[PDB]
Symmetry: C11
Subunit: 167 residues, 11 copies
């Protein structure tokens, strides 16, 4: 075991526009409930492992800002952060080679044509005694992103040489 | 056996517009009657397994919101939930490979070019003594979705070692 | 033998508009006379097996609503029902494989490129002592549905072990 | 021999319009003289076997309505009927396969690329003592149909096991 | 020999229009002089064998009406008749196969790419004592019908067993 | 020798328009001097053998009317006649097969890609004692015909079985 | 030797327009000096052998009129004549075969892709005692005729057995 | 180890425009905090290693300007610099060869289709006694630069024989 | 040697227009100084050998008039002449065969894709005692010609059988 | 060692236009500090070796003027110069052959698809005792040039036979 | 050695306009200093060897004018000349063959795809005692000429047998 918890992010968005294309109405957003893993003074790592398929719409998407806004039990925004993430580029021939050689896994469902993007919104987050962390608002500032789901993973920074096992 | 009840969902919608395109008129909606499997205190898992073909119109559909609205015998809404689901991406070469190597099943009807999307609208649902669950309203906020049918599956969350049989 | 009667449906529709396209003029509707297979209390299964060719126009058709309206000898409407049906998708590579390997049946007329859609408008139908069933109106809310014919098949729900004869 | 009479239908139509395309000016119609094969009480089968070539124009035609209107010696219309008919769909690969294998008949004139469509406008037509059947008006509500000719075939419904000989 | 006379039809038409296209200016028409083969009481078969090349312009022509108008020495119209005739369809692969296999005849002029259409305007024609048949007006209601020539062939209806000589 | 004379026709036409395309100003026409081959009472055959290349412009030409107008020494018109003619259709594959197998003649000039059309404007032309035949006016009612030349040929109709030698 | 003289024709034309196209400005024309070969009473043959390339511009040219206008030393026009000539049609496959097989002459300059068109303006020309022939005006009524040069050729009509030297 | 510190840059930008294109709303900008490695007198090399994928959007980008703006703890700007950088060009054939031969690394994630651009904004930087370096603002003056991340790498200019460890 | 002199022509022309295409401002012209080859009474041959490349712009050029205007030392124009010249046509297949088989000369510069056009402006030019020939003005009436240079080659006409040596 | 110094040029330019294409706001420019290599009286060679990739945008660039402006310590301009330079042309086949036969160097980074253009702005530059050279301004008058960097290289002109070592 | 001097030409031109195309802004010009090689009375050959790449833009350039304007020490213009020059045409097949066979030199830089054009502005130039030659102005009247450089070359016309050293 390890000192960590996963809070999957359930993005929702508005749907009242024309919607005559593959473009959503409003920017995806979400609340998350963090209600210990956090301890006073200790820095913690907060990331949003985000699951993007390699569908053609996503390749043409380009960069898009991602922001996280932590807050307290009373809703007060403790801190704000932002990072830019982009689906990694792979050439069309490379994709075909990847699809071919990994056919034995993709066909049986052991592998899938998706990318996990590790947007590290915090390399060192520390608990405040007078201001407790209770939940997070997470956003993906783009109306054309296609995604399956996202996890807000927290873990104590102290890992040592054992970090190599996560490769 | 399993302590569960499958309430198949029959989506209906309006049809009075011009309708000169594959796009429909109004947002698909449904009303399902849940009338025990539910018991007080016990958490329950509510999911809508959605049967989408891999037709080209669906691959270009993009993300689309799905919402479930539970309510009582008197119509009062107990709780409201929403999730976003999308048909999984598969490259054209992969599809040609899937269509070929699984031809022996598709041709004889043992397999079909369709995806079951497990929209989990409630990972832990529990019954209220003063507010009984009687029915649900289920929506798919898109005028371009093509679907065959949907089951609202409720199952007691206790799995334990029994997962080996459900895998 | 089986306790059933087949009431083939003969759709008719208006023809006075411009009609300069494969799209018809008005919504296909039909009337069918049910004049006993029905008995008080016993549940009955009412379905409309719909014969759709796999012609290209039908594959781009998309979903379309099919509604049934039962009524009495006096014309009073007993109940109203609706189910959405869609022609099953088959990739272009799959169709060519079907056309090829099943050529020996397609050419000699033993097989044809058509689909039967089992639109089950009623899984539990029962006769009412004060309201006798006499006939039904059946509709297919689409101006582009190419079809050959349809049967409204009623059958006693008691199957039990007898399903093996139907399998 | 059989108790039947064939009354070939000679469709004629107006031609004063622009006629700048392959679309006729007015709806095909016809009069036919049925002047016994009909006898009182017995129901009879009336069909219009319609000879449509498989030319590309006809495949894109889509559905079209065919109506038969019987009438007496005095011109009074006895009954009106309508059945929708469509040319059966065959894929381009299948047609090429049919053309290749059946070349030995198509080239020498023993076979032709045409479909006989059996519009059964009456499965049970009964003669009336006070109203004799004299003639019929037959229509094909489409300006884009291409056809060679049509027979209105009548025959006593009493066939029994002998019907298999018509296969 | 046989009791018959062939009166070749010389279709002529006006030409003072714009004529900037393959379409003619006015409807083809013709007079033909029949002045015996016709005798009182005996039925006669009157047909117009029409020589249409299988050119692309003719295949896209579609159906076209053909009318015949008999008349007396004084010009009085005896009877009027009309039929619809269409060039028989043949697929491009079939046409190529015919051109290839029957090349030996086409190249040396023994065969030609033309269809004889037997527009049978009268299956039973008889002479009237007080009204003699003198000549006929014939028409082809189309501005796009490419043709080489036409024979109006009359013949005694009595064939009987003699059809074997014509088979 | 034979009782015949040839009067080659020299068509001339106006040239004052824009002429920005392959379309001539006015309908080709001509005068021909017929001044014996003609004898009183005897009917004679008059034809115009017309030399048309198989150039693409001519294949798209379609039907065109050709008229002949005989006249006397004083210019008085004796008779008028008209026959429709059209270059015979030959498929592209047939032409390629012709160009190939007959290359040995076309290349060395012994054969040419031209068609002779025998417009038999008169199957029986009779000389009149009171009206002598002196000259002919000939026409081809089309502004798009491409032609090399034309012979007007007259010959006594008395041929008998010797006609086969002209094959 | 032969009783003949060649008077090469040198066409000239105007050049004042925009000339933004391969089409020329004005109709080609030319004078020629015939100043004996001509003798009184004797018929003579006057022809213009016209050297046209087989360039694409010429094949789309179509027919074009050619006229010759003889005149006297005083300029008085003795006689007027006109003929219509056209470059002979050769298919694209034939031209390629001509280019290939006759390469050995075309490449070394012994052959060239050109046609000599023998526009015979006079089959029988005779000299008049009171009116001497001095020169001729020659025209080619087209603005799109690409040509290298032209000879006007005269020769005594008497050929007889001497044609063997010209065949 | 070496006398150096890395200060990764986290660019953020506005997201309120239409954003219906791969172009971003505003110029990428960033703020980086440097709070020693810097010492008085000693020259230092400040560079921004920038991680650009080889995606087609970036190849068409063309030259873009990158600027750095150092400043103190109080915000006072110490020095301003600017260098223009561009992604290196590689032909489509070269890219395919790179993708092919280096497939064994790209597929397993050991290699990726990205370029590190060493924008050396300062070859000789030295600390000021009265003005301390605290942080730097960095920019990329282009709305279309797709990038993963960047490091502001500082290192003592003293290399000498130690370059062998960096080669 | 021979009694001749070559007076190379240097064409110069205006250049002040927009010149946004491959078309020149004004008609090429030039003066040439002829200052004995000429002798009184004797007719002489004057030609302009014109060096046109076979570039596509020249093949589509079509005909173009070329004129020479001789004049005296006083500028007085002695005589005026004109001829029409055109680059000889060579099919694309012929050019490819030429470029191939003559590659050994083209590559080494011994042969070049150019045509010398011998525009013979005077087959017999006679010197006048009272009017001496001094210089010439030579023109090429086209704004789209591409040329390298030109020689005005004069030579005594008396050649006899020796003319064959010039081949 | 050699009597020379290299002063790399760092072009900077404005960036506040629309910038919707691969074009820049203003002409590239730069200052450079030349602060001995220069000596009085001796003329010196000054050049700008310019590193241009062979990317397609640069090939379509065409010529572009380059200017150098020397100046003194006080900023006074000593001399001005300009030379036009252009990236060398290499055919598509040649580039592919180079990309292929030199793959072993391009892939490993030993070679790159770039061209060094040696714009020699001064073959003899002499130092003035009363006017010292201190710095230079260098420009590239094009908004579409793509370049990596430029060196302004100075070297004493006294080379002799040793110049061959620079090959 | 030889009595000659090469005065390389450095073309400069304006750059103020939009310049959004490969076409330059103003006519290329130059000024060259000629400051013995020239001696009184002796003829001299003055030429401009112009280095043009075979780039596609230059092939479509077409003919253009080049002029040289000599002048004295005081600027007085001594003589003006103009010769029209054009890049030599080479078919695409010839270029491909040239690129292939001469690849070994092009790849190593021993050969280049460029043409040296010798514009012989003067074949006989002589010095005037009262008017000395000091410099020249050279122009290339085209805004689309892509060029590398140009030498103005003078040489004593006396070659005689010495041409063998230059062949």
């Amino acid at each position: 075991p390890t000192v960590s918890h996963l809070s999957p992010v359930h993005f929702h968005y508005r749907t009242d526009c024309d919607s005559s294309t593959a473009s959503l109405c409003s920017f995806p957003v979400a609340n998350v409930s963090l209600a210990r893993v956090l301890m006073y003074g200790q820095p913690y790592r907060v990331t949003l492992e985000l699951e993007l398929p390699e569908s053609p719409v996503n390749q043409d998407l380009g960069m898009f800002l991602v922001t996280v806004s932590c807050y307290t039990r009373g809703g007060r925004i403790i801190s704000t952060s932002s990072r830019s993430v982009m689906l990694h580029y792979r050439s069309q021939l490379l994709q075909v080679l990847d699809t071919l050689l990994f056919s034995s896994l993709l066909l049986f469902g052991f592998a899938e044509q998706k990318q996990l993007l590790e947007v590290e919104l915090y390399s060192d987050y520390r608990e405040n005694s007078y201001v407790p962390t209770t939940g997070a608002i997470i956003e993906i500032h783009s109306k054309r992103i296609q995604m399956y789901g996202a996890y807000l993973r927290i873990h104590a920074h102290f890992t040592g040489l054992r970090y190599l096992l996560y490769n």
